DNA sequence: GGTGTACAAGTAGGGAATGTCGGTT
DNA sequence: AACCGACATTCCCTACTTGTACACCTGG
DNA sequence: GGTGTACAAGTAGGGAATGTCGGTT
DNA sequence: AACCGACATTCCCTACTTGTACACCTGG
DNA sequence: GGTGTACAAGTAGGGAATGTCGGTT
DNA sequence: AACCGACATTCCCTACTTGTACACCTG
């Protein structure tokens, strides 16, 4: 009856009764019948038993040689880590299924890259690196974030649907969503805030623009609202290089307010707290959220800003230095 | 130095040597030592040996109870098959991790749903059903497909990048891509085709628009090219309800050419061979493609439309029949 | 409309695990 | 009888293969 | 910033697997 | 001695738990 | 975002309708 | 008073323009 495993047990038991090899074998036929391993394989078990080898496991078997080294497929990734299996395959003379396996066998996983706002010129980066160095230099001499009042502009549609993920048996349809229309109803939000909260915001009506003209009016209203909400206020103002924000007219509206405008490189939303922090948070919050009327957008926004904590804003602003640092370490290339 | 499995082999060995249960135990202690099991076990083993049962492995142990039933979790999916695990867990009173497991244990996988072009109206679904019904009723009677000349219009940006997928160790990042610009240079393409190939295409200059005026012009230009390339043509025209396609003026330009316009319910790009099949194949081929010159866009298209085997277009058109059935059986809801 | 990844199942080798057998004591 | 060495036979485990399912793309 | 899934590791508890022991022959 | 039945003790295997990593999101 | 059709409302124009004026008995 | 033709206005009624909905195709 017994298998190589059950057999070796016996031969250990037979070993421990001082039975000789050939003796044990006789007992096996006596016990189980003719169909028991040959004497030769008893003599063998015995020969290793005498060494303290009662190790049950077969010694490691034979294996077809790997038709390509690990470090070989690894060094292909070292040139272009974003190739398909089929592409790697035809460089290693194996199938894709083969390249499927060895990538699973090595620690490797497949992950999808980041979208970055803009392709940056050899120069575009230099400007970033500079600004970031400049601000850090200042940051070390004296913390000044406590003086920062930034703000920016962000669309808010009346419907924000996301593609839905369904848990269902294989080869079945996942509940589907209807596209967000590119030319749907939307209202521009313009919001200004500081490390202690949101100072002032305007929610523009559907078709409304922001021009050198209106921008002025706004930061004068901001000023008015600043006077009451921030009594202690000099003051530092951070905003991106909108065609509207660099307006000859507006530049002067800032001088005549005695506001210091922190330098800001273009295509750098990763350095604008309004974008990388405030809005980013709102992005999550707006998911699948509907707005029937312009009134409710303002009501949601109102309760949304209000129901934030204090630290939330504080944290947004104080992550600047960390970003300026990366912004330099990454040498101007996006760092996010 | 035996285990709760190895000793059982031995007890089988002794059973088949006509040794008494207690006798065998005395042999166990003699051979191995003092850490063998009791005689009480040997007696028990023997008692099941005396039957024909020499099955080594245990009986199934005591296991905790299931806190909810597989089919009870199934009722939640029947309601809403797209729910986060956390949400299911709450309804079941178990943890998320708990549900992560029972979904693994059941057949269930996670799938991303579709983007359907437009949210359809109780009415718009009927329009679709009918039109599909009508055309199919006819196709059954007499195949009118080889007479179908159809066309549409589709943008083509000068840079078509895709997020890149990388094979990498966990934690390490994947190569990032610069985002496609919504406002980049983009030439419009107006193309008309037929079961045997493309008849006449018109690649517009950047700014160029299509109005009641220009559409007519093209329809005539089409006809001329149709006379020499398709020397046999009466023509059936298929085109979507673009405001330009549905102008008073144009319907008359179509009459003057004597073309049967097939009815085509609004919001039905899934029934326009131009979109659902020709541009579809294009979207793939256009991936990661850069176009520096307007000439190359034409040079690309020329060589592309050309190298396309004749059947390709044939299949495109002949897939209408099944889309109609499918459009019909699904009562007008989208069906892709 | 195309394409990319992984589960199936089959297959060839590389040796171990085993057997055979003539040689020793 | 007992055990051995050497060459032959059997078996086991893996790195591949082709075949295939299928998630997700793609045009709106 | 925010959140959704799964790999770790620990824990209870339900019985089997095993032990203990005085009762039979 | 041998084996038993009955009650006690130990051990094994799982369905959960909490803790945590981390892909991917989110603003541009 | 582009674009066309369908009325709903808002200006002009050739007609009217009415007004002014000369004439004659 | 009576009455005309000859023009000049005060208006309409229709008639060309705008103005203000929608409707349909792209991502
Ligand atoms: Mn901005
Ligand atoms: Mn179209």
Author numbering:
A (entry chain A), B (entry chain B): 5 to 237, 243 to 345
Paper text:
Cut-and-paste DNA transposition requires a transposase, often encoded within the transposon, which binds sequence-specifically to the transposon IRs, makes a staggered double-strand break at each IR, and then inserts the cleaved transposon ends (together with the gene they encompass) at a new genomic location. mariner/Tc1 transposons usually integrate at TA dinucleotides, resulting in signature duplication of this sequence either side of the transposon. The well characterized mariner transposon Mos1, found in Drosophila mauritiana, has 28-bp inverted repeats that differ by 4 bp. The inner part of the IRR DNA sequence is recognized by the Mos1 DNA-binding domain of one transposase monomer, in cis; this domain (residues 1–112) comprises two helix-turn-helix (HTH) motifs connected by a minor groove-binding linker. The outer IRR sequence (containing three unpaired bases at the reactive 3′ end that mimic the product of the staggered double-strand break) is recognized by the catalytic domain of the other transposase monomer, in a trans arrangement.
Crystals of the Mos1 IRL PEC were formed by mixing full-length Mos1 transposase (T216A mutant) with duplex IRL DNA. This had a 3-nt overhang at the 3′ end of the transferred strand, mimicking the product of staggered transposon excision. The Mos1 IRL PEC structure has a similar overall architecture to the Mos1 IRR PEC described previously and comprises a transposase dimer bound to two IRL DNA molecules in a crossed configuration; one IRL DNA is bound by the DNA-binding domain of one monomer and the catalytic domain of the other monomer, and vice versa. As before, two additional IRL DNA duplexes interact with the catalytic domains, possibly occupying the binding sites of target DNA. In the Mos1 IRL PEC, the linker is displaced out of the minor groove, by a maximum of 1.7 Å at the amide bond between His-65 and Gly-66, as compared with its position in the IRR PEC. This is due in part to the higher GC content of the IRL sequence in this region as compared with the IRR sequence; the guanine 2-amino group adds bulk and hydrogen bond donors in the minor groove that obstruct transposase linker binding. Moreover, the pyrimidine-specific interaction between T16 O2 and the backbone amide of Lys-67 in the IRR PEC is lost in the IRL PEC because T16 is replaced by G in the IRL sequence. Additionally, the O2 of C41 (base-paired with G16) repels the backbone carbonyl of Lys-67 in the PEC IRL structure. Surprisingly, in the IRL PEC structure, there are additional interactions between the N1H and NH2 of G56 and the side-chain carboxylates of Glu-345, the C-terminal transposase residue.
